[PDB]
Design a protein around this ligand. Structure first.
Ligand SMILES: C[C@@]1(c2cccc(Nc3cccc4cc(Cl)cnc34)c2)COCC(N)=N1
Ligand code: NA
Ligand code: NA
Length: 371
């Protein structure tokens, strides 16, 4: 409890390609790098020699593999994969010293799923059974982990924005954050759904009906890059950010994520860009707290050229890597709550820092949830 030195800095990645952890599947153990995803609930790994893959799960080499004789087809907005379901023994070498039997989707065919040039070969869906494919009877990895061992029912993530970080399975490491954790309820166990109750750009309340912030939901998602906002809310959001940054100028394509913007090095104009504050529903009636991020988070380096990493959504709010990179995030499943604290490793400058502050008084917070 409070210290897990063997799990610190167990995450790796490249900018724009996500955060992965080392895992092993099978007996004898086969090592794979696996993308950490709080926004889905399947453990799925490449199992055939797709050209983009450094390696893949070879079931024939595992004595502990059990076939479930069942297939799954998983289409996403743009990409898809299909696989064969089975179970096997799974470990996390820089995680707890346990081995569990978990469901695994052996990916046999995929389209626009694997990234050319990336160093990961599968995905670890850490969300709940409700959104597992093909249905909620396929037990997610973390559920199996907790069912089968003494690992406490929680994990935490420090995403450090080339990239790195920590996944603490079964606890919290207090070295990884400053100040206090502040918790928001998980509204429902499907995605890690939360409720946003107020939004400010540089102190300026958007003053929208707070229902709009969570239309049709708001989720915390390590498998998405952007801070994604409901269209109606995005429209208000950029309008205020554009106006806040009207000092200098960039094309209108930039704000729709349709083109990059560039400055010469040593001299990105950070200060003309506003901070973004999300107030989150608190643990107590009429009580909220707020988390604050920087352009460092929402203007993402591409290789000094940057993408604007806030975008509109038809799927609700998605607090992706743009948000999580400012914070140590505690997925306290046991108490159905999400904790945020200022990350010890977050990218900032000498003028502004990421912030987690409270308590604030906010009335009618339950009206903020969409139904
Ligand atoms: C299943 C699904 C999925 C499927 C495949 C890859 C990813 N993740 C990613 C890909 C490429 C770049 C990334 C950079 C970051 Cl920071 C984080 N995830 C990244 C996520 C669908 O999309 C949303 C979701 N939550 N999970
Ligand atoms: Na247990
Ligand atoms: Na601390």
């Amino acid at each position: 409890r409070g210290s897990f030195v063997e799990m610190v800095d167990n995450l790796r990645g490249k900018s724009g390609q996500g955060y992965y952890v080392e895992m092993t599947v099978g007996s004898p153990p086969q090592t794979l790098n696996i993308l950490v995803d709080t926004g889905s609930s399947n453990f799925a790994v490449g199992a055939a020699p797709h050209p983009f893959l450094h390696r893949y799960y070879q079931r024939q080499l595992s004595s502990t593999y059990r076939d479930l004789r069942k297939g799954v087809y998983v289409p996403y907005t743009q990409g898809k994969w299909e696989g064969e379901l089975g179970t096997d023994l799974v470990s996390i070498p820089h995680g707890p010293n346990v081995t569990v039997r978990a469901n695994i989707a052996a990916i046999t065919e995929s389209d626009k799923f694997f990234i050319n040039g990336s160093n990961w070969e599968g995905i670890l869906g850490l969300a709940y059974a409700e959104i597992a494919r093909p249905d909620d009877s396929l037990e997610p990895f973390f559920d199996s982990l907790v069912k089968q061992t003494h690992v406490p029912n929680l994990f935490s993530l420090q995403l450090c924005g080339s990239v790195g970080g920590s996944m603490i399975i079964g606890g919290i490491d207090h070295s990884l954050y400053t100040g206090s954790l502040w918790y928001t309820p998980i509204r429902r166990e499907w995605y890690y759904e939360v409720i946003i109750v107020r939004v400010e750009i540089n102190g300026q309340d958007l003053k929208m009906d707070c229902k709009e912030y969570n239309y049709d939901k708001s989720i915390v998602d390590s498998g998405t890059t952007n801070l994604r906002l409901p269209k109606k809310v995005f429209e208000a959001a950029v309008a205020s950010i554009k106006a806040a940054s009207s000092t200098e100028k960039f094309p209108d394509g930039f704000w729709l994520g349709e083109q990059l913007v560039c400055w010469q090095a040593g001299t990105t104009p950070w200060n003309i860009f506003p901070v973004i504050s999300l107030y989150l529903m608190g643990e107590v009636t009429n009580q909220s707290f707020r988390i604050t991020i920087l352009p460092q988070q929402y203007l993402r380096p591409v290789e000094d050229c940057y993408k604007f990493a806030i975008s509109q959504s038809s799927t609700g709010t998605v607090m992706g890597a743009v948000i999580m990179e400012g914070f140590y995030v505690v997925f306290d499943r046991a108490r159905k709550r999400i904790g945020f604290a200022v990350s010890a490793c977050h990218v900032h400058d000498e003028f502004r820092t990421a912030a987690v502050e409270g308590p604030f008084v906010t009335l009618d917070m339950e009206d903020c949830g969409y139904n």
